Amino acid sequence: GVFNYETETTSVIPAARLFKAFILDGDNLFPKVAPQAISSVENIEGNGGPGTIKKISFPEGFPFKYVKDRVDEVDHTNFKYNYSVIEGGPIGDTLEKISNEIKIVATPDGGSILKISNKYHTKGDHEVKAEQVKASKEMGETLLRAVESYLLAHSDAYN
Numbered sequence: 001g002v003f004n005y006e007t008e009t010t011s012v013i014p015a016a017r018l019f020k021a022f023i024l025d026g027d028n029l030f031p032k033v034a035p036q037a038i039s040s041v042e043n044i045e046g047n048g049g050p051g052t053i054k055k056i057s058f059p060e061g062f063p064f065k066y067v068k069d070r071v072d073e074v075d076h077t078n079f080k081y082n083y084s085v086i087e088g089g090p091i092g093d094t095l096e097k098i099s100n101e102i103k104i105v106a107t108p109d110g111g112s113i114l115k116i117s118n119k120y121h122t123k124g125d126h127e128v129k130a131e132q133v134k135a136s137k138e139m140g141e142t143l144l145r146a147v148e149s150y151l152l153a154h155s156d157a158y159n
């Protein structure tokens with residue numbers, strides 16, 4: 001079955017720039033700005049569009065060793081990015097996939113709002129716990145804040 005979770009968060013960075021950095025250049029930025037959260041990102045197959053597979057490794061001591069994520073869609077006009085967790089970590093006999101959608105929207109103050117949906121696809125019917133969703137949110141927020149801090153400090157990056 002599918003369990004749907006939605007959240008929203010804000011950024012002080014304008015949408016297009018935040019999209020170029022946090023979404024389009026995450027493979028590079030995440031291990032650089034948040035090494036305590038992401039040890040490395042490996043491109044396994046594909047050139048960045050639908051179907052591209054990445055292996056994201058976590059630091060020692062984390063609950064999981066890695067996940068493989070697959071790019072589902074990338075909308076460079078409307079700042080939408082869809083990707084799925086397809087192997088590793090929580091994926092296995094109870095959880096087939098996590099499908100995610102991120103949309104970044106401009107706000108008139110010059111920042112942005114990120115709208116995030118996480119859909120957990122379980123085998124038949126087993127149950128997703130608030131704890132697993134929380135952990136995802138916390139990771140996403142750590143990464144956002146680390147990227148935001150970098151973009152604040154490096155004005156010539158991603159313009």
Ligand SMILES: c1coc(CNc2ncnc3nc[nH]c23)c1
Nearest residue numbers: 026102116118136137140141144
């Ligand atoms: C690429 C990898 O992770 C992201 C961020 N998605 C995201 N950001 C902030 N909180 C989240 N919660 C679930 N997904 C989230 C983009």
